[PDB]
């Protein structure tokens with residue numbers, strides 16, 4: 033639509049705008065290693081995080 | 083004549099209000115000069 | 127009770143040739159500290175004055191059961207062997223550190239006449255850690 | 269343990285022409301030594317692992333300067349593993365002779381951090397005017413340093429936090445304090461003659477602040493020089509402990525040259541907001557049912573439950589997420605401080 | 617164990633500010649409000665927002681959140697059930713002349 | 714006297730109500746401290 037999604041090392045989840053670097057929503061949870069992502073999946077409107 | 087009364091007023095107002103003394107002399111002090119030097123910290 | 131060895135040194139070249147200078151006697155049960163000393167031989171007096179003429183250092187050392195410290199010789203021998211030891215320890219009991227400081231002040235240069243310095247008018251005290259107070263809730267209340 | 273020295277020009281981003289020397293051995297520590305050379309450059313002494321010094325701008329001029337004034341230069345080193353401190357000094361040639369030594373048992377105390385005054389500060393007033401036009405002089409001791417420790421036997425009846433105040437030159441403890449029932453990650457500031465540390469009390473499950481001040485007395489002892497090899501008499505410590513309604517992240521103090529203006533404490537909360545707190549609110553000399561002297565001295569008795577109202581938050585809606593740190597730098601105007609908060613996201 | 621919660625604003629159509637909530641005490645997120653997998657004790661939670669205010673609540677988990685006052689450990693003001701917070705308008709960080 | 718003094722004392726007030734929240738200059742001779750709170754009049 034306008035957007036892409038990432039899932040980084042710093043446990044963040046972002047929803048960047050694919051015309052210019054800018055954020056719509058972060059959902060940073062936890063610096064320390066009990067929120068570190070291990071997989072990711074997009075069902076075409078939503079996401080899934082483990 | 084005038085000397086006496088003038089200095090009497092001076093001395094009384096000093097004895098209750100005026101004098102230049104320690105607190106007032108405080109701001110005429112230059113700071114000391116560090117003679118010794120220490121630097122270090124953790125062991126990286 | 128316990129005993130503790132104590133070494134001292136002073137040279138022209140600021141080296142380490144630590145030798146014994148008497149022992150400490152410490153009561154664990156109740157805090158008490160005591161010293162047992164021997165007074166200086168004359169050769170040590172000469173060497174010490176020759177040191178003080180160069181702003182050398184008087185160094186002291188004891189073991190952990192190491193730890194050291196130092197102080198200029200001038201500010202000591204200008205004080206007729208007036209010195210002071212502090213012995214800092216931990217909460218549970220272990221030697222932590224040692225401080226040697228003279229009374230009074232420092233160097234002026236005036237001659238001592240070199241007959242005063244066989245007395246060792248010294249003094250010792252330990253000091254454990256002071257606790258720290260809570261936030262005095264009474265005045266907080268009213 | 270290898271180490272590398274990269275020199276450049278911060279304006280354009282370029283390596284400089286002069287090539288740095290090649291370090292063979294693992295480095296331990298370094299100091300900056302504001303004495304200059306004939307090109308207006310500081311000297312950056314580095315200490316080897318075999319206790320040998322290297323001086324980066326190693327020209328003849330600097331070497332003669334050092335062969336003159338070496339014995340007024342002292343290093344202090346610290347290893348938390350076995351818990352021991354050491355202090356060395358220079359010689360005419362560049363070597364090191366162990367001068368003082370000191371330990372701490374690593375089974376009941378574990379060093380957390382070590383602080384020393386910023387060299388780039390200048391303080392205006394050497395004394396605090398008392399109520400009745402008297403004076404209380406304050407002990408500065410540039411070469412001081414604070415040490416903070418915490419226990420090993422972590423359990424919330426027998427936990428304790430330790431403080432030590434040391435001189436870097438001799439190795440003598442000014443003060444050695446213990447605060448029981450407190451464990452938490454600490455946060456410390458050691459400024460001109462005051463100290464602040466924040467911790468967590470397990471006996472009423474609340475954060476806390478503790479503050480120290482050092483005052484020598486009513487007179488001045490060699491007011492012009494302050495050689496640290498000459499002070500027998502140790503100062504009088506004042507202290508006090510308040511409570512705080514929240515948690516903490518990086519904490520710092522303001523700064524400006526000439527030290528005139530009031531000093532604040534910049535606090536990083538967890539929610540990302542910053543808080544400016546006036547130091548004059550944390551004063552151990554607070555009336556505590558005032559006399560009339562304290563009344564005159566306007567010392568605002570013993571503020572209970574030091575407060576939090578959102579009228580002094582810098583970052584209104586500019587929250588910073590993690591806030592691992594803060595940097596404060598001085599302007600040239602002496603009424604402003606420049607603030608930079610760094611975490612997962614910058615602020616300025 | 618876990619912490620259920622509602623976090624509401626009077627008339628401000630919540631969804632928007634859900635993009636900027638991160639509840640601390642263990643961290644949780646918004647939908648409503650849930651914090652999974654914690655131990656039992658006396659924990660004080662708050663609902664972070666950069667443009668809103670939310671008064672904290674002191675749970676002492678069986679769930680009972682009584683009050684936060686920080687002065688008198690032993691106190692009970694028996695707040696019924698989970699973290700109603702009343703969204704006390706916008707906080708005033710700006711100051712007039 | 715009255716005509717002399719008054720239009721000089723009424724204007725100082727205007728000024729100190731207008732140019733209040735800052736500093737102006739330095740006098741090169743040290744003064745006494747008790748007279749501070751009325752020479753600055755905006756400063757904290």
Ligand SMILES: *[C@@H]1O[C@H](CO)[C@@H](O)[C@H](O)[C@H]1NC(C)=O
Nearest residue numbers: 205206207208229245247248
């Ligand atoms: C021993 O110490 C005391 C402590 O005040 C001092 O008065 C005395 O002069 C000292 N002895 C000598 C020989 O200086």
Ligand SMILES: *[C@@H]1O[C@H](CO)[C@@H](O)[C@H](O)[C@H]1NC(C)=O
Nearest residue numbers: 117489490491492493494495
């Ligand atoms: C003060 O210290 C300086 C430098 O150490 C010294 O030259 C001077 O004699 C000292 N004077 C006093 C009164 O302590």
Ligand SMILES: *[C@@H]1O[C@H](CO)[C@@H](O)[C@H](O)[C@H]1NC(C)=O
Nearest residue numbers: 584585586667706707708709
């Ligand atoms: C931050 O909040 C203020 C009022 O609290 C508002 O005027 C401003 O627009 C907000 N900034 C952003 C980027 O939303």
